[PDB]
Amino acid sequence: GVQVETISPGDGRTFPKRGQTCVVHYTGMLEDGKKFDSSRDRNKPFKFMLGKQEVIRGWEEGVAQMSVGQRAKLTISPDYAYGATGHPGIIPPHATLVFDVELLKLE
Amino acid sequence: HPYWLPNFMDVFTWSLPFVGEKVTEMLVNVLNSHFDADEIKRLGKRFKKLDLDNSGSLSVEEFMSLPELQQNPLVQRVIDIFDTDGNGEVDFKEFIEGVSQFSVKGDKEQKLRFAFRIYDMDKDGYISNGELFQVLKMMVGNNLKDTQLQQIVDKTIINADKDGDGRISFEEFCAVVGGLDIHKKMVVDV
Numbered sequence A: 001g002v003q004v005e006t007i008s009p010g011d012g013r014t015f016p017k018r019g020q021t022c023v024v025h026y027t028g029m030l031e032d033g034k035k036f037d038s039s040r041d042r043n044k045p046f047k048f049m050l051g052k053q054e055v056i057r058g059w060e061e062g063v064a065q066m067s068v069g070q071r072a073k074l075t076i077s078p079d080y081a082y083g084a085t086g087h088p089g090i091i092p093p094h095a096t097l098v099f100d101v102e103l104l105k106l107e
Numbered sequence B: 001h002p003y004w005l006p007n008f009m010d011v012f013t014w015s016l017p018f019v020g021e022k023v024t025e026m027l028v029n030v031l032n033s034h035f036d037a038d039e040i041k042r043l044g045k046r047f048k049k050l051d052l053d054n055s056g057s058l059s060v061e062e063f064m065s066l067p068e069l070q071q072n073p074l075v076q077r078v079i080d081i082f083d084t085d086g087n088g089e090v091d092f093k094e095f096i097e098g099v100s101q102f103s104v105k106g107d108k109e110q111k112l113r114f115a116f117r118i119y120d121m122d123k124d125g126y127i128s129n130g131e132l133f134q135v136l137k138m139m140v141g142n143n144l145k146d147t148q149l150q151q152i153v154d155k156t157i158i159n160a161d162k163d164g165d166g167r168i169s170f171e172e173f174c175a176v177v178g179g180l181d182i183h184k185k186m187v188v189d190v
């Protein structure tokens, strides 16, 4: 599934629930480490509402285990990412993904 | 430095998987021509259950009553495309003819015609720059800067505008999209 590994810890109490919106900065890399996307390169944090089927299952299960201020490395299996199909022109099939995610704020 | 999509992708190849996913999700949730007698009879039952005010035409307020459609950014486009006569609401004939574009055993070209109609807001047959930006804005929201989204919209149209009229016709759209097989994702059981 998704393996959450802490890089920098945040406040332990505030965890995002269903209906809340997580404001994050992320850098997406293939399993070998090669970057394919980064919100930091865009200077625009990424936002999504939990429980509304807006992100891959690795982000739904992974970011939920994170807390405000925490920065973590998310290793996501294909079945929780883009599976045996991949994403056209970006993610290859059966690709394990590594996401460096930091939960900036909840709104 | 101008912004590029991952792997220098065009905005159609980039947004189409999300388009096909969220349109399928909307219809599957609404359901919880190419039809036979029983399949039309099944659709008549699920239509009357969502009419709410019994006016005989599904409106925007009734569509947003389902909680699974509240955060779906492609709801209004599907409603706008279903609204064939353009009266703001969806009749039963528009409902049947709108769902028929996603039934299995349907044509591939008509499924690409619906994908084209997602971006072609005014339904004139050409995707203008303002249309492509606005529809992508509904899906992107605040996750991109308007300057970033405007830049990739410009590059996509410029590279896809074969005849040079600043718009994307269905033939130009099919030249960019054809290899995606997006029609295989636009299938709903009846």
Ligand SMILES: CC[C@@H]1/C=C(\C)C[C@H](C)C[C@H](OC)[C@H]2O[C@@](O)(C(=O)C(=O)N3CCCC[C@H]3C(=O)O[C@H](/C(C)=C/[C@@H]3CC[C@@H](O)[C@H](OC)C3)[C@H](C)[C@@H](O)CC1=O)[C@H](C)C[C@@H]2OC
Residues within 6 Å of the ligand: A028, A036, A037, A046, A054, A055, A056, A059, A081, A082, A087, A090, A091, B005, B006, B014, B015, B017, B018, B021, B136, B139, B140, B141, B143, B144
């Ligand atoms: C107009 C289309 C819309 C795009 C945006 C609103 C901009 C937004 C910043 C996406 C990036 O755009 C520059 C870009 O980011 C990635 O690079 C990434 O790093 C990732 O993986 N992210 C990034 C976010 C964290 C989780 C994870 C993810 O879930 O993304 C979702 C995704 C791709 C879901 C697919 C859709 C179809 C379905 O078949 C499939 O089922 C498994 C799941 C995005 C946010 C869609 O909800 C909305 C869009 O698609 C992935 C590779 C591609 C993605 O571009 C498309």
Ligand SMILES: [Ca+2]
Residues within 6 Å of the ligand: B051, B052, B053, B054, B055, B056, B057, B058, B059, B062
């Ligand atoms: Ca009504």
Ligand SMILES: [Ca+2]
Residues within 6 Å of the ligand: B082, B083, B084, B085, B086, B087, B088, B089, B090, B091, B094
């Ligand atoms: Ca109508």
Ligand SMILES: [Ca+2]
Residues within 6 Å of the ligand: B120, B121, B122, B123, B124, B125, B126, B127, B128, B131
């Ligand atoms: Ca148009």
Ligand SMILES: [Ca+2]
Residues within 6 Å of the ligand: B160, B161, B162, B163, B164, B165, B166, B167, B168, B169, B172
């Ligand atoms: Ca043109």
